[PDB]
């Protein structure tokens, strides 16, 4: 086994900021990790390259992945528009946890969030499937452009993304 490493190169108003890399827990959350991996490479025909982080709430999390509507309403998985919660074995234990954003039970699509804090209230409601491997400083930097209701000061995009390992 070797878990995928995927990266996002973040751009703020078109100007590249830095890279955040993630290890995806494919050995424990295989279907959720494969969905994020294939959307990072774009091998199915659509994906994250170019999408923005539409919702950033400082001290909580940074959310993105809505590559169809760019506002929290769209996105689709490689499986169909929505797929089921695979399991809840992993918890939201601290900053850097990568988890599925959803609109209730069994509504996984392509949106995801990166916790910048331990968020125990999300356990059992959002499937954790990865963690930041390097670039946590870039995540902290992204936070400064968010607001209490999640709106961003600047246009935060995924300039490029793909799979390293």
């Amino acid at each position: 086994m070797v878990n995928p490493t995927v990266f996002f190169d973040i751009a703020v108003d078109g100007e590249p900021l830095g890279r955040v890399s993630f290890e995806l827990f494919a050995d424990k959350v295989p279907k959720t990790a494969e969905n994020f991996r294939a959307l990072s490479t774009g091998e199915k025909g659509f994906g994250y390259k170019g999408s923005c982080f539409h919702r950033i709430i400082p001290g909580f999390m940074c959310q993105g992945g809505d590559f169809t509507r760019h506002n929290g309403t769209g996105g689709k998985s490689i499986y169909g528009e929505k797929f089921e919660d695979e399991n809840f074995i992993l918890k939201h234990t601290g900053p850097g946890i990568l988890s599925m954003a959803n609109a209730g039970p069994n509504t996984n699509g392509s949106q995801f969030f990166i916790c910048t804090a331990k968020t125990e209230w999300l356990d059992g409601k959002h499937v954790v499937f990865g963690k930041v491997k390097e670039g946590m400083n870039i995540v902290e930097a992204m936070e400064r452009f968010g607001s209490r209701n999640g709106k961003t000061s600047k246009k935060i995009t995924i300039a490029d993304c793909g799979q390293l390992e």
């Binding site: 959310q63 988890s99 949106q111 968020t119 999300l122 209490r148 209701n149």
Partner: peptide, 12 residues
């Protein structure tokens, strides 16, 4: 209608 985790502020 908009997806995503519920914020601390939405809870209190």
């Amino acid at each position: 209608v908009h997806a995503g985790p519920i914020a601390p502020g939405q809870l209190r």
